[PDB]
Structure formats: structure tokens, C-alpha cells
């Protein structure tokens, strides 16, 4: 019944730099993302593991939001399996990445007439970083002190002037990541639950797990964290009602 904010993720007066991308966890909410279709008219809104429309019918266990600001033409770096400074030195996504990417132009908010300086990025790095890894250390990479031949400062700031043409204007990027259907559900939209019917061939949707069959009382004793029941055939045998805690067997019609 709770409504997780999506405010401090999106409605934030100052996003973090790409090299220090802000990480937030979302849990225990009715994630009505339906605002996110059109509340801002994003330039880029692309989803990999699931179509955006179907996202209202899937229940998650963990949701992570990454917020930062990157150079315009560099937005394509955010897709998985890409290469370049942004996608290799300060932010990388896994090949099997699920969840999806939102990016919108923010020239007015972030650009400064004299050139913005809050937003930084890592240009020098010893080696590529693993997916969803954050590095903040600011030692000098190829040398003592801070400067010298090949002794260059790792971090540089975009000269975000408003007069910069498209492809240089700062873009604000928010990336969502969430797992699908292996644990007790924690985050998903309304999907207003109805009364539960037993001993009758009906379709059912429990925490995203969809099926059709006959629901019966069962004597199996699952553990407190256990949610799904399975057979040797790997089918779904027994599930526990999220609202009230009892176990129900499913029999094919």
C-alpha cells in the first residue's frame, strides 16, 4: 500500500557526477511507475528485460536506481555491451542487465554560463571496471604530487555552457535494475488483488507468477522465507498467498 517516492531519484535539484553515480534502493511500495511514461517526456526511455507496458504486472525483490549526468552524445554508452570512456572508466552495465534506462536533456538545469564545474568524469583509469562498480579514489594515474608528464589528474569537468550544441548539453540519466521472480516479492504496481477462490479451475497471478489451475489446501511446511514449491519437473506446485500466510497447492485442470 506504500508509495515509494521516485522523487529524490527524479525530482532532485542536483544529480551526482557520473564517476560518483548515486545509488538508491527502493523496497516495500506500490511502484506505480505510470507517471514515468509521460510525466517528463524523456528523450530516451528504453527497456531491455521487459517492455515498459508490461512492467505494471511484475513483482520484484529489489530495485536499484542509479542517477547521474553525462555528456549528450554519450547517452548511448549507457546501454549494455558498449565501449568508451563513460562505459568503461566510471560506469558499466552487465551483459545480462535487466531493468531499464531513462535519460532526458537537462541543459537549463545543469549548464552554467561560465561553464559548470560540479559535474566530473574519470578520463584516466588503470583498467576497466566490473558492472555496477563505483570508484571514487582520486590518485594520479599514468609521477608524484598531482601533475607531471603522464602524471595526469584522473578527473575532469565538462564545460557545460548553455551555448554548447546538441551532443554536448548535459543529459540526466536514471537507470533502474530489478530481479524477476526468484524471491518473496517486494516492489510492484497496484494490480489490485481480488478474493481468492479454492477448488475451481481459474487463472491466478501471485506476486507476478502467473498460471492456470485448481487451488487446494496443502499440508506442506515451507520455511519463513520459502515462497514457491517445485517438482522434479521444475513446475510450480505450491505457492504462499502474499496477503494472508497460508500455502496452496496448484493442480492442472
Amino acid at each position: 500500500t506504500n508509495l515509494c517516492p521516485f522523487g529524490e531519484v527524479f525530482n532532485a535539484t542536483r544529480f551526482a557526477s557520473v564517476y560518483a553515480w548515486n545509488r538508491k534502493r527502493i523496497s516495500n511500495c506500490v511502484a506505480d511507475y505510470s507517471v514515468l511514461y509521460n510525466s517528463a517526456s524523456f528523450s530516451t526511455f528504453k527497456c531491455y528485460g521487459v517492455s515498459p507496458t508490461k512492467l505494471n504486472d511484475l513483482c520484484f525483490t529489489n530495485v536499484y536506481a542509479d542517477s547521474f549526468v553525462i555528456r549528450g552524445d554519450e547517452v548511448r554508452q549507457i546501454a549494455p555491451g558498449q565501449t568508451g570512456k563513460i562505459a568503461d572508466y566510471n560506469y558499466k552495465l552487465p551483459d545480462d542487465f535487466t531493468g531499464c534506462v531513462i535519460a532526458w536533456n537537462s541543459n537549463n538545469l545543469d549548464s552554467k554560463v561560465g561553464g559548470n564545474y560540479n559535474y566530473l568524469y574519470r578520463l584516466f583509469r588503470k583498467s576497466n571496471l566490473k558492472p555496477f562498480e563505483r570508484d571514487i579514489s582520486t590518485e594520479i594515474y599514468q609521477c608524484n604530487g598531482v601533475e607531471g608528464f603522464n602524471c595526469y589528474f584522473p578527473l575532469q569537468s565538462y564545460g557545460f555552457q548553455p551555448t554548447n550544441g546538441v551532443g554536448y548539453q548535459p543529459y540526466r540519466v536514471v537507470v533502474l535494475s530489478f530481479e524477476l521472480l526468484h524471491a518473496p516479492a517486494t516492489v510492484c504496481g497496484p494490480k489490485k488483488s481480488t478474493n481468492l477462490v479454492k477448488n475451481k479451475c481459474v487463472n491466478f497471478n501471485f506476486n507476478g507468477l502467473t498460471g492456470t489451475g485448481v487451488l487446494t489446501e496443502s499440508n506442506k511446511k515451507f520455511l519463513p522465507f520459502q515462497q514457491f514449491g517445485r517438482d522434479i519437473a521444475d513446475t510450480t506446485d505450491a505457492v504462499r498467498d502474499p496477503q494472508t500466510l497460508e500455502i496452496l497447492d496448484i493442480t492442472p485442470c
Epitope: N11, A12, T13, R14, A40, S41, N108, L109, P162, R172
Partner: antibody, heavy 121, light 108 residues
Framework: QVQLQQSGAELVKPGASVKISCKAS????????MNWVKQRPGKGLEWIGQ????????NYNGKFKGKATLTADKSSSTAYMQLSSLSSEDSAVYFC??????????????WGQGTSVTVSS | DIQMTQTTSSLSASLGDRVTISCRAS??????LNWYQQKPDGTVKLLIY???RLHSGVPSRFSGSGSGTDYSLTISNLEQEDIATYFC?????????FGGGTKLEIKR
């Protein structure tokens, strides 16, 4: 309740300097821009300047650059505005507003009661 | 800086009638416009943002529309407390500017 309260009316001799305080209650004052706006009577609103209490980031209008100084007070959650080299034309009503972000733009959602400042002898 | 202009400095209207206030900008600002309302006593509050989003606590009788360099605020049914001064402010470029402001009166 989100309340932006300002000081009373000021009477200032020309050439002096005057301080105006805008205190925010019920707001995360250190996470949103404070925009200061001038209104002469019968004339349109003029965007004086803007400050970020979180780190002191400031953006000043070209016309009012240098003339007005903005400072932040995290402890009491108050934005201070200092006016120097006052003249008779500076007599106006000054508002402090909060710069919320609608994820695309910045809007001055909550406004103060407005401080009337008059410069004369 | 972006030049913000309201064609009608003031206008008179009757109760309950639809009232349209225009706002023309020198340069395209997409839909980065905000409508503010200032009471005669001096109190001012936000009314509309992003040219179509109704602010919290604002009666639904207000609406916004427009694109490019021309926008308009519409009152579906004018009511007594709606009599105020309306300002359109851009947010495309950092030196934000406000319109000249439009004042409403009764037909008399």
C-alpha cells in the same frame, strides 16, 4: 507547514547596505535553490538571483551582479541577502522562493511573504 | 536573455466565463513555462508548471496550453477569488524572466 518567513519593511538611507533574512520552516532548506526576486510597484517581476545552501553555489542575474550578495545559513536554515550602494530606485518588494525541480525544469513553488524595502532620507 | 511578453496588460471579464491569457516568448522554450498567480494583497503562489501540470491544491478550473513560443492559461469558470495578477516565467535559459503580468477586472 512549508513556510518562508521574511523580515519586516526596511527604511534605508541612500548609499547604505541592508540585510534581509528569509527563513524556511518545514523544508529541507539545504537541498533546494533559493531564488530572490524583485518587484517594483506597477512593474513586472525581476529575477535577482539564486543560491544553493547545500554548497553555496550561486547564480546571479547580469543586471544585479555584484550589487546583491546571497549567503546561506544551514544551522538556522535562512537565506541572507545583502544590498549595497542603495539608491531610490531599489525601493521595491523582494521575494524568496524555493526552486523545485519537475525533472525537466525548475519552478518557484513556495514563495515568501515579501519584504518591502524603501530607500530615502 | 529570453524576452517574455504578455500581449494583454489587463482585461475585464464576468464571473464564470472562460478567460484566456496569452504569453509570447522571443525564443523557443519548448514547454518550459510556469504560470504564477499573485493576489492583490501581494501573496503569490505557483499555479501551473510545464505549461500543463496543475499544481497541488489548485482548483481544476485552471488549465494551460501552447507550444513553441506561444502559450496560454485558460480559466474555465471565473470565480471571485480568481481575480489576481498572472505572470508567465520561462526556464529555458539561466537568466529567467517574468511576463508583464495581467490583471483581471469585472465588466463595469
Amino acid at each position: 507547514q512549508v513556510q518562508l518567513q521574511q523580515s519586516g519593511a526596511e527604511l534605508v538611507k541612500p548609499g547604505a547596505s541592508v540585510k534581509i533574512s528569509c527563513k524556511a520552516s518545514g523544508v529541507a532548506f539545504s537541498s533546494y535553490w533559493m531564488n530572490w526576486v524583485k518587484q517594483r510597484p506597477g512593474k513586472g517581476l525581476e529575477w535577482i538571483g539564486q543560491i544553493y545552501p547545500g554548497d553555496g553555489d550561486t547564480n546571479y542575474n547580469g543586471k544585479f551582479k555584484g550589487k546583491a550578495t546571497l549567503t546561506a545559513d544551514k544551522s538556522s536554515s535562512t537565506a541572507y541577502m545583502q544590498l549595497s550602494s542603495l539608491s531610490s530606485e531599489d525601493s521595491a518588494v523582494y521575494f524568496c522562493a524555493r526552486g523545485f525541480i519537475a525533472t525537466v525544469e525548475e519552478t518557484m513553488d513556495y514563495w515568501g511573504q515579501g519584504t518591502s524595502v524603501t530607500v530615502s532620507s | 536573455d529570453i524576452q517574455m511578453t504578455q500581449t494583454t496588460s489587463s482585461l475585464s471579464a464576468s464571473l464564470g466565463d472562460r478567460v484566456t491569457i496569452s504569453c509570447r516568448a522571443s525564443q523557443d522554450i519548448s514547454n518550459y513555462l510556469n504560470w504564477y498567480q499573485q493576489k492583490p494583497d501581494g501573496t503569490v503562489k505557483l499555479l501551473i508548471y510545464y505549461t500543463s501540470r496543475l499544481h497541488s491544491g489548485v482548483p481544476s478550473r485552471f488549465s494551460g496550453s501552447g507550444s513553441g513560443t506561444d502559450y496560454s492559461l485558460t480559466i474555465s469558470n471565473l470565480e471571485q477569488e480568481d481575480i489576481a495578477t498572472y505572470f508567465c516565467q520561462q526556464s529555458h535559459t539561466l537568466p529567467w524572466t517574468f511576463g508583464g503580468g495581467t490583471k483581471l477586472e469585472i465588466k463595469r
